[PDB]
């Protein structure tokens, strides 16, 4: 006998863990879990319908930036999986598995788990050219990066090369990056920086990597697809309950036709209308 109200006005304040598979990032952004920040090792190869990113999340590894951050974040979020497939690249002539004191894993100098810091070997950094063929029937996503040393001395001691150059190509595309040597403010006492890039390799296409220095190399690929998973920023706790619709303010019932809680929703939801 309630009077008709077609607008859902309130949320339960929490996000229900059913029926959608919720992955709570806690202290880890999706990108940090993608790259393999040591504090994010528990996220390896996890799957999700909705990844939830928290305001409190923070980075605790080598200071980096991602020029096309939103597109990479959206690429992984929609695939719904962090499953990583290692591949054996032929890195002949260089030293692998560089580590840093800004990235501690188990009380030891370490690095992003999914990236490979290549440096000179006996003060020789040859012109690397490696290929990876992609014989699968899905797209491959490769994450790589460029290291920006702080001085010419740093560049020389790391890569035995004053001018590193990186090119990552497929039959469809070409990406060329040049390191920028210079002082940045110290983040966790590190005045250097890394820039993260990504490349999609479609089935039947080949990945080609050329580098004369400064390459933060991939260790393999992620499977990518424009699926139905997504990502959301929210500080609402994950609770035990069942609710088909999810907003950053918490889960919502889907019986009313309309909704004024949040423009951002996930699942089967009422249509948003303003206040």
């Amino acid at each position, epitope marked *: 006998t309630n009077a008709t109200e077609l607008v859902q006005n309130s949320s339960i304040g929490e996000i229900c863990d059913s029926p959608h598979q919720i992955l709570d990032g806690e202290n880890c952004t999706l990108i940090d879990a993608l790259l393999g920040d040591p504090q994010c090792d528990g996220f390896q190869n996890k799957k999700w319908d909705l990844f939830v990113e928290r305001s409190k999340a923070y980075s605790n590894c080598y200071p980096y930036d991602v020029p096309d*951050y939103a597109s990479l974040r959206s690429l992984v979020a929609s695939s719904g999986t962090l499953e990583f497939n290692n591949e054996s690249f032929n890195w002949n002539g260089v030293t692998q598995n560089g580590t840093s004191s800004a990235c501690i894993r188990r009380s030891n100098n370490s690095f992003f788990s999914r990236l490979n810091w290549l440096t000179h070997l006996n003060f020789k950094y040859p012109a690397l050219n490696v290929t990876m063929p992609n014989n699968e029937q899905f797209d491959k996503l490769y994450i790589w990066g460029v290291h920006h040393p702080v001085t010419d001395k740093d560049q020389i001691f790391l890569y035995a090369q004053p001018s590193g150059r990186i090119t990552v190509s497929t039959k469809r595309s070409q990406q060329a990056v040049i390191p920028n040597i210079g002082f940045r403010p110290r983040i966790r*006492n590190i005045p250097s920086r890394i820039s993260i890039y990504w490349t999609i390799v479609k089935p039947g296409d080949i990945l080609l990597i050329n580098s004369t220095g400064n390459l933060i190399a991939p260790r393999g690929y992620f499977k990518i697809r424009s699926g139905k998973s997504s990502i959301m920023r929210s500080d609402a706790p994950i609770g035990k309950c069942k609710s088909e619709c999810i907003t950053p303010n918490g889960s919502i019932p889907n019986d009313k036709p309309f909704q004024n809680v949040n423009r951002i929703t996930y699942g089967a939801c009422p249509r948003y209308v303003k206040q």
Partner: antibody
Amino acid sequence: QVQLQESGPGLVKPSETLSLTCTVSGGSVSSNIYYWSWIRQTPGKGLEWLGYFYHSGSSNYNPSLKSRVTISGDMSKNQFSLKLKSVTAADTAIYYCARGGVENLMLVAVIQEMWYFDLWGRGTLVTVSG
Amino acid sequence: DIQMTQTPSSLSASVGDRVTITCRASQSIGASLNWYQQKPGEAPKFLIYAASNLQSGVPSRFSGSGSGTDFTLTISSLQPEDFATYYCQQQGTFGQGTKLEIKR
């Protein structure tokens, strides 16, 4: 190390164009990760950022200074200059040149624009008076 | 557009004391806040970057903390040479400053 040093007149008449030049020693003024800035300090305001300039032609200025500010550079001389039009007594200040930069770093779940000024000159007093 | 409030404007503390200086933004600024130390007759010195990262030449007794709107600069054990004016800074705006005198 890299060092900055301001040069210019210490007394400027009102309605004149204040001009100061910063000379950079030991560093590559040519590197587009750095911008080159001017900040002034008066007791009664403290520090006030005036503007910065990238050699690539990009620049950014304090809107409080109604576009009276122009910063330009010359790499033949490893120098950049401040120009401040139509000065009055309110422009009497200690003027500093500074090096800094802009970073787009993710932290607190959101990428934000960060500015900084990591290297400063010694500063120069400019008195605007008749 | 964003204005920061530094408290207190001035204070005195003894050698060995722990002093904390607060900067508060009118809006959230994430962690995009830096600190500078200006000793008398000198230009400001780059102290802390992105709320908590100590810069080169900064003694270990300096630390910073905060997120969103409330940020603090802490000197764990005050020294006579720490006499200076301290400034917070976010993008193109500086705090009003905090002058720190050494009690004696």
